[PDB]
Amino acid sequence: SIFVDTSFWAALGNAGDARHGTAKRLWASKPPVVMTSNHVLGETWTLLNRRCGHRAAVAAAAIRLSTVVRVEHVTADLEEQAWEWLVRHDEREYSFVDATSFAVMRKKGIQNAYAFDGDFSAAGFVEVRP
Template sequence: MDAEELAETPNNEETAPDLVAFVDSSAIVAMVDANDNTHGAAVSAYAELLQQGYKLFTTNHVIAETVDLLDAGVGPDVARRWLRDHRLSIYHADEQDERRARALVISSRNPRGLSYVDAVSLVVMEKFGVADAFAVDPHFLNETA
């Protein structure tokens, strides 16, 4: 997926091209895991994003992280089912994205550090001019603020 495809591949016909939100693994895990403390809020937020016509996308790195988190949290069957059934558009980070993400991680002054997956996410959001993120991880949300 490139920038043009991202803007031109809406969830439904009424979607404006500028209604784009990046989806973080924290939101996906919260929606899938009914025992997650933020499950209800995540499900409601997802429904609202769809109702408003947002185009939702993520990266190949977030897909990998999500499968690992679901596998560890709710089990491999649920992780495989989500991987098979999800309908998110996936942007595959390129070499330039990877270089910029590495530089972000290395230069991070955040006392908790910056995960590589979050760094790739931030780079991709900036690359496409996406300001909206669907996440429940306060650390990711702080990085996007």
């Protein structure tokens, strides 16, 4: 029912993030079903490791172990859909991870995303706010 992006994980995992407060409130009122991807978690590791350090990044690594967060391994076929999508959408600057995230959400029938800063909204999803 909700897909979680790197931008959200990074805000939640970094108390110094400007959107940390918003992320915490959203996390408190999340639905029972919460999804993310291997690509997102990997990006989150890299971001937090660079910004906060190894210990903070390990927190991101541990999400893959969660019993209450569903971590989808993006298949080769979903990556292919994301690639074809990226090639078509030249109207805006989209990252590969975001493209795979969009493909996962489309496949799973999810429109609500836990995410910040606009890419998901532009691609037709809802960036949930309090």
